[PDB]
Amino acid sequence: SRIGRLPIPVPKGVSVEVAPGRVKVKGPKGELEVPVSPEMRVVVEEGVVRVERPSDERRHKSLHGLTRTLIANAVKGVSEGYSKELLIKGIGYRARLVGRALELTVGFSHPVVVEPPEGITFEVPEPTRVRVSGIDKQKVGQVAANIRAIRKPSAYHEKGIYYAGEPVRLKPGK
Amino acid sequence: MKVRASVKRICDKCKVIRRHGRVYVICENPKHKQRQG
Amino acid sequence: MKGILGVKVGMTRIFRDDRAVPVTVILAGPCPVVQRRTPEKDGYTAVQLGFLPQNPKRVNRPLKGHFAKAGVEPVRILREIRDFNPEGDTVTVEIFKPGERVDVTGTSKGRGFAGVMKRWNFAGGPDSHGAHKIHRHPGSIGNRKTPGRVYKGKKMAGHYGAERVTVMNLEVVDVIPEENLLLVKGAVPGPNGGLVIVRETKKA
Amino acid sequence: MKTYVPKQVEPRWVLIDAEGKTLGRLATKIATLLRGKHRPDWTPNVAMGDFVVVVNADKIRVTGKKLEQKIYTRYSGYPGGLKKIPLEKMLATHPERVLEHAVKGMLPKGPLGRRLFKRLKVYAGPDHPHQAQRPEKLEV
Amino acid sequence: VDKPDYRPRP
RNA sequence: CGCUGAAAGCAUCUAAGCGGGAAGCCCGCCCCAAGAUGAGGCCUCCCACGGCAGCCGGUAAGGACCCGGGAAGACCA
RNA sequence: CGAUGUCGGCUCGUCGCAUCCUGGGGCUGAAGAAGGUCCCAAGGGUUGGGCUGUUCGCCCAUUAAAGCGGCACGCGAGCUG
Numbered sequence A: 001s002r003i004g005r006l007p008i009p010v011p012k013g014v015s016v017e018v019a020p021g022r023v024k025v026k027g028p029k030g031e032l033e034v035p036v037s038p039e040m041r042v043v044v045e046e047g048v049v050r051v052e053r054p055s056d057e058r059r060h061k062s063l064h065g066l067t068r069t070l071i072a073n074a075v076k077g078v079s080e081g082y083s084k085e086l087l088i089k090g091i092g093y094r095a096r097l098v099g100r101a102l103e104l105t106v107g108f109s110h111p112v113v114v115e116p117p118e119g120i121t122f123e124v125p126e127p128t129r130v131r132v133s134g135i136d137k138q139k140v141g142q143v144a145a146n147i148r149a150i151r152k153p154s155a156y157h158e159k160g161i162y163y164a165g166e167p168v169r170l171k172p173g174k
Numbered sequence B: 001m002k003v004r005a006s007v008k009r010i011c012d013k014c015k016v017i018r019r020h021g022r023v024y025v026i027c028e029n030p031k032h033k034q035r036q037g
Numbered sequence C: 001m002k003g004i005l006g007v008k009v010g011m012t013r014i015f016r017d018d019r020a021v022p023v024t025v026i027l028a029g030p031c032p033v034v035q036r037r038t039p040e041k042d043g044y045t046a047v048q049l050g051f052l053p054q055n056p057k058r059v060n061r062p063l064k065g066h067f068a069k070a071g072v073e074p075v076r077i078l079r080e081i082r083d084f085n086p087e088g089d090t091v092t093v094e095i096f097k098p099g100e101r102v103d104v105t106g107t108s109k110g111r112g113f114a115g116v117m118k119r120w121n122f123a124g125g126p127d128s129h130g131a132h133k134i135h136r137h138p139g140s141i142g143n144r145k146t147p148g149r150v151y152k153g154k155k156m157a158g159h160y161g162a163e164r165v166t167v168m169n170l171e172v173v174d175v176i177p178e179e180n181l182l183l184v185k186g187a188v189p190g191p192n193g194g195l196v197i198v199r200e201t202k203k204a
Numbered sequence D: 001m002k003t004y005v006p007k008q009v010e011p012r013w014v015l016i017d018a019e020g021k022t023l024g025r026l027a028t029k030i031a032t033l034l035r036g037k038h039r040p041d042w043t044p045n046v047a048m049g050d051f052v053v054v055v056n057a058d059k060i061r062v063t064g065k066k067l068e069q070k071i072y073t074r075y076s077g078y079p080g081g082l083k084k085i086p087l088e089k090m091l092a093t094h095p096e097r098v099l100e101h102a103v104k105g106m107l108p109k110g111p112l113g114r115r116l117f118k119r120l121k122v123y124a125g126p127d128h129p130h131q132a133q134r135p136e137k138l139e140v
Numbered sequence E: 001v002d003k004p005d006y007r008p009r010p
Numbered sequence F: 001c002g003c004u005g006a007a008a009g010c011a012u013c014u015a016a017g018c019g020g021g022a023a024g025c026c027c028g029c030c031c032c033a034a035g036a037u038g039a040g041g042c043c044u045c046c047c048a049c050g051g052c053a054g055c056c057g058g059u060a061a062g063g064a065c066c067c068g069g070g071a072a073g074a075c076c077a
Numbered sequence G: 001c002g003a004u005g006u007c008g009g010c011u012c013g014u015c016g017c018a019u020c021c022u023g024g025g026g027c028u029g030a031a032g033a034a035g036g037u038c039c040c041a042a043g044g045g046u047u048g049g050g051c052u053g054u055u056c057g058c059c060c061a062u063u064a065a066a067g068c069g070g071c072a073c074g075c076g077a078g079c080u081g
């Protein structure tokens, strides 16, 4: 039953330097700063980072898990990276890359152009599939949400922007 | 969203959540979504 | 944020593409810059402009000094335009091209002590049906014991006009540099002969 | 024998670094200094407290959710004329007012209390213009 | 709401 | 409505953190505004005059009075 | 009770929000358009007329809408009567 105590396997060759209230996580794909509570101790071991909590007080237990996972995700980010795929669905609906930017054709009277923020890379393998990639797990997931929101999945039709692996639940109309 | 003084689980998939000082009920069934008020 | 001082000369209409355009004609040029206000010196940025030449006989000594320090012949009016900083040592109508939109500030015509119907378009009282000596009166001014007073700002009779008014987003219809004329479409506060300020518009 | 009354005294200037101090509990001490009640010759009907210079007022602290929830209030006399400005914003726009407003309420009302508040000189940021007064740094 | 004069006219 | 996320191995918009989001709120526009006695600032002008933080006298820059007037105005301004 | 003028109208507002409209939103037995229902929202807006002393109400013609209340059933040293 526990996330804070479970150790963070750290592959070759990503580095983890601790500082009071932050840890820096470097890797093949860049750096990431994990702001982290003064109250938790982050502990650097052989090929392992661990986090330890001062007591079994509720707040401490809560900060504990969050902190491990925050670091664990940092670690994975700079090594493997992070990504989400979006499938576009429906007859008119298409994507294409205009330079580094993502242009969306989804049934509005105009196309929708999304700019990549620093750290995010847009990719369009087929035209009804978009891939958002980066080393920051939250940023990736966020930009994905942004893109998806441009045209939510309809309630009545397989139509709109869907996350990969997101189930189609429709309801009848008449 | 249903807004009421009595918030309860309606189906077995209903989940009671406390969020920003308020009681909600979240559920996969949208009808069951409630906030106390 | 260009601007200029000038006098309202009068209105007419011109014809432009088979259309009558009602215009006010403003004598604007030429305005010698006589001080620049700067962030280091003054704390903000703007240009004191002068306008219309004055008889030196009528310029007292403190004024003369101020003019002297600019190498500027004395002038009847000094007024600043904010956040404007012309490269020249002189501002003229040329800073406006026809088509541009401007804001014009004037001193409005003075109505003096105005009743409530002229000041605030109150409805006044009936003219018959029994109205007793109240045809142009304001009616009630309050409630009863609560609150027992009259609001600050309650519209009432009093002086009206001879006030600063700025009409906005007027089209520049034409500019005649050789005569320092700016032709603006519509109406501009105040009497003919009155001083006005023409600024680049703040609307988009 | 009648109680002693001080003849006019030369007023002491004092400097307080507000950074990180808790708004209300710094305020009461400022108030005391202003009244003059640290002085064994305290006299209630004359201004004989210290002039108080406070710096880093913008870095005052506040417990609980007050930044979001403490509302400062101004009535204009006009209909609808109650302005509500929250701590956050006040700090963000005129921070020295936050200390100022707190101390002011902890002074007596009346001519003298009004005068004492004039003896308080509060600054956001670490510096102040009262060097000519060589204000004595005070830990409170 | 019509209710009766409690005072007479002056 | 979210992202990321523990407590609570799952889940959770939240407990740490971040995002979107109203004709509404703050700014922005227009007008008043330093009696803002917390009486602000800038430019220019006068000057350190006689007799005994005070009184009396003559001036300086300047101002008022008076007059001719004014799309300013009840008088005043 | 050695007087706190009393319904309706006019005039002039100002506030509340349990919102009539306009803005934002959740659910819908929401395909769409249009609705219902609840939530946030008081910035602004909220028509002209026939009847009747009427407030109210009914009715005609429109409207985004034709909101409901407080202010001594707001307002007679303000008018009406």
Ligand SMILES: [Mg+2]
Residues within 6 Å of the ligand: A010, A014, A015, A016, A044, A045, A046, A047, A048
């Ligand atoms: Mg290591």
Ligand SMILES: [Mg+2]
Residues within 6 Å of the ligand: A052
């Ligand atoms: Mg240890």
Ligand SMILES: [Mg+2]
Residues within 6 Å of the ligand: none
């Ligand atoms: Mg249907």
Ligand SMILES: [Mg+2]
Residues within 6 Å of the ligand: B006
């Ligand atoms: Mg029930």
Ligand SMILES: [Mg+2]
Residues within 6 Å of the ligand: B009, B010, B011, B012
């Ligand atoms: Mg059940």
Ligand SMILES: [Mg+2]
Residues within 6 Å of the ligand: B015, B026, B027, B028
């Ligand atoms: Mg759920």
Ligand SMILES: [Mg+2]
Residues within 6 Å of the ligand: C105, C106, C107, C195, C196, C197
């Ligand atoms: Mg003018």
Ligand SMILES: [Mg+2]
Residues within 6 Å of the ligand: C109, C110, C111, C112
């Ligand atoms: Mg007049």
Ligand SMILES: [Mg+2]
Residues within 6 Å of the ligand: C115, C116, C117, C118, C122, C124, C136, C137, C138
């Ligand atoms: Mg009138």
Ligand SMILES: [Mg+2]
Residues within 6 Å of the ligand: C118, C119, C120, C121
């Ligand atoms: Mg008018």
Ligand SMILES: [Mg+2]
Residues within 6 Å of the ligand: C121
């Ligand atoms: Mg009229």
Ligand SMILES: [Mg+2]
Residues within 6 Å of the ligand: C123, C124
């Ligand atoms: Mg009328």
Ligand SMILES: [Mg+2]
Residues within 6 Å of the ligand: C123, C124, C125
């Ligand atoms: Mg009439």
Ligand SMILES: [Mg+2]
Residues within 6 Å of the ligand: C126, C127, C128, C129
């Ligand atoms: Mg009538």
Ligand SMILES: [Mg+2]
Residues within 6 Å of the ligand: C130, C132
């Ligand atoms: Mg009569």
Ligand SMILES: [Mg+2]
Residues within 6 Å of the ligand: C131, C132, C133, C134, C135
């Ligand atoms: Mg008459």
